[PDB]
Amino acid sequence: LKGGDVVRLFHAEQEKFLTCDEYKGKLQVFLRTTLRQSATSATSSNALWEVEVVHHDPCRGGAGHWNGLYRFKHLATGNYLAAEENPIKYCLVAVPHGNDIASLFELDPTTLQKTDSFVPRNSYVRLRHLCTNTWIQSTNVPIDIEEERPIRLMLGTCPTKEDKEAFAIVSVPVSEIRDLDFANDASSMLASAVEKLNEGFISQNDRRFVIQLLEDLVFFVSDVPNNGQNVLDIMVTKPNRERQKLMREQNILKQVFGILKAPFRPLVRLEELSDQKNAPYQHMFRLCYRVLRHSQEDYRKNQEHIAKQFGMMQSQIGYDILAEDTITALLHNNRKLLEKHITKTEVETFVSLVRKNREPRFLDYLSDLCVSNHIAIPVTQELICKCVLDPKNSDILIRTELRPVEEEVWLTWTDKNNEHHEKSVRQLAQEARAGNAHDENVLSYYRYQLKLFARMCLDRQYLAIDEISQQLGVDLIFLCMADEMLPFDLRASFCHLMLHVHVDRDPQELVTPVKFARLWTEIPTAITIKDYDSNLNASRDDKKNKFANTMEFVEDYLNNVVSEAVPFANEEKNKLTFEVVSLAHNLIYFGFYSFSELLRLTRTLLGIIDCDIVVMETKLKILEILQFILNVRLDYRISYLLSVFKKEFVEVFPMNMNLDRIGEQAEAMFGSMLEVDDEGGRMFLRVLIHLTMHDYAPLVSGALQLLFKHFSQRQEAMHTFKQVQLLISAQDVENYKVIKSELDRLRTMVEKSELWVDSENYQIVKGILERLNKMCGVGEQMRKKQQRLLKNMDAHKVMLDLLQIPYDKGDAKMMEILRYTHQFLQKFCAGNPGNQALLHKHLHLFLTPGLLEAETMQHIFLNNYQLCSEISEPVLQHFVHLLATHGRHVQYLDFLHTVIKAEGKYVKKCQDMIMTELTNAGDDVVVFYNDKASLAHLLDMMKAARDGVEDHSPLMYHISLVDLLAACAEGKNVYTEIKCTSLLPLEDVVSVVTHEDCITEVKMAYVNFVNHCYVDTEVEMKEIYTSNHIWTLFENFTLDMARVCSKREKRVADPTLEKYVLSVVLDTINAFFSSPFSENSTSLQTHQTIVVQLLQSTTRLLECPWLQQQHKGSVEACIRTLAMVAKGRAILLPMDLDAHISSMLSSGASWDYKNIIEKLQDIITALEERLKPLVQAELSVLVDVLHWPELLFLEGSEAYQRCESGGFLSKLIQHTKDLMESEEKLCIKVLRTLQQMLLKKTKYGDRGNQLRKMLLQNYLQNRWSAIAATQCRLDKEGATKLVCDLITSTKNEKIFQESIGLAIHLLDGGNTEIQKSFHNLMMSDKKSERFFKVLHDRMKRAQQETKSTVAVNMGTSVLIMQPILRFLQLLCENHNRDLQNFLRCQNNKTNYNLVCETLQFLDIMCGSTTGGLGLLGLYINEDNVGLVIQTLETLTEYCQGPCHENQTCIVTHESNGIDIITALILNDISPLCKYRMDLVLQLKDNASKLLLALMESRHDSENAERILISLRPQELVDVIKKAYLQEEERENSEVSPREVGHNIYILALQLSRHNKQLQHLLKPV
């Protein structure tokens, strides 16, 4: 730490970064809040603080000292942070100079420091104000209370010193300060330009200098040096987000906006920009706009800043300023901002300017505006549709017609002169070929207009598709496409237009390839490839006729592509290839192609891609087509197996099964005709591997997915058939038919949303919704069957689109329909985990500011503990934000109430998040009436609702809030208990309860509140146990009990009061008297009458007949507790009451539907058992395929060289790292596949070996030492770095487990090369600290969980420790001194001692001091014995070699784990010995080995003495003698008591060298 250096000071308590900013035109120093997930992630150059050290000479700075005076300086402003009097005695405020003693501050180290040495960097400091002799502190109150969502936190001063009030130093890159200084310079130049603008005078040379400044700013913003190209044309692939943020905070964008605005404010005029005088001004505006476009690229915050300036963009539009392109970029970047910005007048302005210019670029701007992220925006598309289809704008659009002249096409276009021309399309194309500029321009304009029409019709917007279809016909488009005379680009534009207008329309609908449900009657007696398609062939034949010619066009075009030697050589041909492939994909997905045609098309599509953005996109689309065709093959196989089952059922029972025959048949289908390619499956593999080698990330991901699926055909088909459902019941079949018809009708209506949204359609769909609500069914079993049928139907998707349909608040009929739809979704999710997961998939739609949607979300999350565990803090933030904004009703609170508890289980993190969010929201959300006036208002409302309370009354809302707080209180959660106790005092509850008139529901809520907030407290609060308000509440409880009993005696009673006394009151009293903490209180002697009267009231409650049997039993338990209390609490029972209490003590002392279904289940089971090994063989084939990729490719090829160099495996590893975040399942599968590659080969039986042989022969031509060689190959390809990076940065438990498993498999066998690679990576890389931190933190958490479990008396945290310890042992295997010493001290800034952590883990698992005492048998059980053995083995591996430092550490550690290690040998471990003696023997042997390793080569006697102190000699000798006798009792096992005793004897001798008594005892007879 030195003066003149800058660091960031972070406050741990506030979890905020100190920043200084000009909030209200005046600089304020504060603790800013950040919405970013990581608090440290959010940082600011303004937040940067420069440290200055006071020294004798003002110029001299020297280096900082803890005692030396420190001054902090806001970097951007340069003003020193200072403490000044606050109107919290003093409040921090910046000062211009350090001359004033206000800036001076004193720093106190949080941790001990060496004398007054120089302050270490990145060290915690305690701030204080030496000037005023006070200590600085942070306050929760914000410095910007006025603004919404205040981020700035005020900082005050206190005389006392607080350890919590300390700030941590954080290093700052010099580049950040250099960028801030250069940004201040850039602001200075911008201010010089602004000064010239304000003066209204700028020389020509000065304006040229401004242009040069803009050019330099362009270079800096791009972060790219000049390439000789125009700064306006400057290109940057990815902007620098840090630089963009710096610009935004510096207001350089604001300066540029002001510079653009001022000339037109005149100095310059937009019309005059055409004049040569203001042409340089126009160029300067252009530079500004280009810089803005580069600045705001892919940054929501920069786009937000520009949004406030969007108006000046609108005004500037219509002139040559490139504002069109900049606006299009920003608007495409953000859609929501586009929704705010869009307005019909801007669409009209675009129309007017594009008409005036008559240029294709303006149309291109609109085309870009229409679509974003390849997804159309409905509102903007509708506005543009109206504007374009307006008859007024007919002139701009080019009209087209077809005339015989066997037919030809002519186009008519209008000039700016308003002259109309008409000409043949072929003649235009030929003139463009000749080179006529006018004809080429009109053809390009027409192409752009065609693309504009397709863009309008994007995402099936019928409103304009109708008119566009009226104008353009299918035959015309087909003729234009087929014609070869026209240019390739125009042919491709026709392809796009056809696809977007006609092929995608209402009559066509997407087809799901595999149908889970089937009809038992429909099941064919026999099935072939033709018969499978025959089921829907008729509809296929009818639909084909419309596009039949286009199908042939597609087929012949793809045939031409495959015929061509070079598939994607020509760019112009590639342009049309993309469109044709996309059209084929769309047709296939809509289902026009038959299955045989799809199988034929697979060969061509794969051959095209068999050994630039457009080519990659085409290959991706081909992959998608292959995916769909494989999905269809799956359903064909399912149908074949179903037909087999039906045929066997018919044969056996005309109305014993030949399962062997059926299995023989099914193995054939699972194993020909159905193959995608005619090469035998080789070509698919080669294409997939080549595409994996390809660079494009989506293409590689898809290729990897298909490659993995290619070798798992059998398992997927078995799973699908297990999911298959058959309809055999007539009633359910009729329901299925009705549901199909109703769903198709509803889906058609939702599709024609535009038609039936503004009639009888509304009533029709209300009726359909009610029909589906009836269809849901009654009864749990019936509901489950109907939910299975619904899942098979996929109606849930149609319902989600119905909800997605746009609407306005005024449409009450539509809101009714939405309510019905929500009820139907509720019925779908009712007690169905699968349906609940499906809803979770699309929950993003459900997240809306609507109470009905919130209730539906509550039902979605109902009773799903896994979903609660994976719940999202952002979702919780959304809910609490809605409550803060409105907090109208109890539904938002009820959602959290449901989240709190699931399956009768609690989640501490969820409860803590709820309470923390409540605290952040503050008193406003948590309404109380504690004050007397608020209590009076509550009393008035309670009196008004005394007869009854509304379901949504504000009193009911407050009650529900209190109930949610009680829900948080449940679970004896000490941490949130603290917040609850601070939240509410017992006195307010006492006042409300003791009020003359209190609502019974309010009383139950408060009794429950006390039941958990105070009785269920994990830690004892002295206040409750010293309060006699409990006895006041108990006399009130007796009054209520008397009221209930007298009511039932009078024959008139209130069920609410009865339940109040029965459940909440009884549970609260029972818990209070059960609490051991309450037993400490001795106020029962003062309130002796009260407690005896409470017992009398409970006895009367039990005696009265109205009490229920369950309530009677609960009351009896409570009365037993009250009796144990009554024995010794200065209370004497009356003798008669004691007679009934003695009676109480005595009481306490006292065609066949089911046949077909079961047969199908049995055949499923039998087939699964039959085919189990074949699945394993098929999976194993992939390991060989990955091992030898070259065999697939032809010998001597370029791809052969690439695979021979190991390209495929290295690319797979690198893409695994790249994709760990994008595709978790794919990453995990790849890691497991690498582990399988590493693992040793194994036989698979006769049938499995036959299958493996056949598969390998078809796919590949034929062309421990092996394990070590494979490990070396993987290490060279880079598995070690992949493992290290995954363990370092992954947040996925599965990914971490798989990474550790891969590390263990790599290092297995103690490979010195892998160990050295790990050491080299650890030493060289800068993240070694991060890796060791991850491992050490995991081990520490495992230790903590083990301690918690021991206190209770097996945890994923403890389970994960086993592979970690195995990994450490394997790293230290073969006595690698470098690794053994590295683990102890990795030589970094922070050193983590994994050896001590392992020893402490052993100690805590064994029980520590209690285990030393000798209760080790109680702690050790069959479950943890393996982990104990592994820990001992790891410690032995650490010690052996020997490593003197490790041995000393283990022997001399403060935990005294050597005592536990010796107690392992000495103790009997009786509970485990009785049942499993082998584990006890193994434990003893490993402990003896560790003890011997500890003293392996130590000549000195310290270690031996320390061991012997714990291990007495006589007991040792007794153990040695006992083992030999135990030999005879030995049962067949690997371990031998004789061998164990021999090892203990060797240890005993080595210890005896030092111990004369042990020597004498060891001497035999």
Ligand SMILES: O=P(O)(O)O[C@@H]1[C@H](O)[C@H](O)[C@@H](OP(=O)(O)O)[C@H](OP(=O)(O)O)[C@H]1O
């Ligand atoms: O991940 P997203 O959607 O971009 O949102 C980010 C984050 O959620 C905050 O909006 C903001 O942090 P603060 O709340 O600290 O401002 C940050 O901008 P920043 O980079 O200016 O912090 C954003 O980038």
